[PDB]
Write a protein that binds this DNA or RNA. Structure first.
Lengths: 294, 294
DNA sequence: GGGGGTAACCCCT
DNA sequence: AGGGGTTACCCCC
């Protein structure tokens, strides 16, 4: 890895949640895939660096599947750093060996397009390392992949693949490094697949007993995949949950839940705990609101 | 007017709750019912010929909401319907009433509207010397199409019943004056969804006071909705919920402050009604009860 | 038949 | 740029 030569490292991953993939018709300039630690105070973008080598290199980025045999995604990166359809590319000058990708879009392919767009991509890979032409059998078989790749491909999750290149024999940058794959990126427009947000809730306080019903208004969530985690910041690390049925999650924008019992029963003074929305599979949370026992 | 044979609508179509279908959804999702239809007792739009007995054939077709009845981009579909989107039932000499019991409304896409429009307009304008007329005036036919498309509501249609008697010279081309029904809103157009209240966090509050209530509702438009409190007639009293558009959360929840009752310091608590109402429409939801306490 | 939800698109500020 | 909402489509039971 780190002493089999020069290698890439992702200095700043893409933000896994909250980024919207755009269909070609929505427009060309709706805003860039940011870094995992971006915020409106200070913006960050996915960043990578070449280690163990200095001097000109070219880093390309392209979308691969969520699946770990990393395969090219039907979706395309779009933006300033990209070509006609040719993928996004940044140049590392020798002093600073790190590349920011600060204007990266994800063009959403329609299902009605997916196969055509994918054959059009597999061809290119066939005519990449391997020789110049495709026999009809060569092509019937390429179309195979397309069909059985469309059955199993998640159009709401992508991974960036950074492919770093160095000047080969002729000075043409076609001698590559091992490619480095980022953490998965969810489409904020896939239902309930954005980041958790607590808009407002109707009670801020209840009895230490628990069982008090609270109306929580949130951004779109999945009835089946959401929870309401109460907790304390301390060495005790106490946690409890909201009590609700799926029918209690109203049209993916509200949760009617009954508060959990506090870890003690006879508090002398009123105690503030935190609650947060949490994703069941994933573990990402919303910003916590305070709740006071007694 | 009893100055000839004439059509009368015995049973109008239901104004609200009927869904218009796009061609791709399917062909057989259920019939436009009568204004007084109900579960178990179904009615369908019905019309009758008066001042005449014997054979007629009645067509129905979709006209604009706009009072100069014009042909709508949408077409009637289903059991009784020819390719051309005009439906016909034949009225036998004994019973002079026609039920249309299996009527669909095929929703044209906006991308289809022009072609669908030029095509219904040509067919309309094709009687006299068709071959050389058509070409001469299709540029200035297309003028209507453009200026008809920007001003046509695809969420409201009217049935137009056109009755035709047997002209024994040829047959069945003899026209009666056409009768236009009351309007039919697409239940899937946001502006026409049936208003429902799911749940509410308080069911009582202080008479001549406004408390904050969380209301969970079906889809509403922030700018077109209200919360009407009302009684079984005492002084035909009504008051409203207090909330700004910001208070209508993702079209499925309303955070509002209850209005004061008309009569401060009531002897004991009084139950009033509350309901969602569209501002312009005048359609409302089934009312929930609210109790004013002193 | 009759729904409920997801996918693609539009357009405001 | 970044949204908020409508339009078109899918598919369950």
């Amino acid at each position: 890895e780190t002493a089999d030569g020069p290698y890439l490292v992702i200095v700043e991953q893409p933000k896994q949640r909250g980024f919207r993939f755009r269909y070609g018709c929505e427009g060309p300039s709706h805003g860039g895939l940011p870094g995992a630690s971006s915020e409106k105070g200070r913006k960050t973008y996915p960043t990578v660096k070449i280690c163990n080598y200095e001097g000109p290199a070219k880093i390309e980025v392209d979308l691969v599947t969520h699946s770990d045999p990393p395969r090219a995604h039907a979706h395309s990166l779009v933006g300033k750093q990209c070509s006609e359809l040719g993928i996004c590319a940044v140049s590392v000058g020798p002093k600073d060996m790190t590349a920011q990708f600060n204007n990266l879009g994800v063009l959403h392919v329609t299902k009605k397009n997916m196969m055509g767009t994918m054959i059009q991509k597999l061809q290119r890979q066939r005519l990449r390392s391997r020789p110049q032409g495709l026999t009809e059998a060569e092509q019937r078989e390429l179309e195979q992949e397309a069909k059985e790749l469309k059955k199993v491909m998640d159009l709401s999750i992508v991974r960036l693949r950074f492919s770093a290149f160095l000047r080969a024999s002729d000075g043409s940058f076609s001698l590559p490094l091992k490619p480095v794959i980022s953490q998965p990126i969810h489409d904020s427009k896939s239902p309930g697949a954005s980041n958790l947000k607590i808009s407002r809730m109707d009670k801020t306080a209840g009895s230490v007993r628990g069982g008090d019903e609270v109306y929580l208004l949130c951004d779109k969530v999945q009835k089946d995949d959401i929870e309401v985690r109460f907790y304390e910041d301390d060495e005790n690390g106490w946690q409890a949950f909201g009590d609700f049925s799926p029918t209690d999650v109203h049209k993916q924008y509200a949760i009617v839940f009954r508060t959990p019992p506090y870890h003690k029963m006879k508090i002398e003074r009123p105690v503030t705990v935190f609650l947060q929305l949490k994703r069941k599979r994933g573990g990402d949370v919303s910003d916590s609101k305070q709740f006071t026992y007694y």
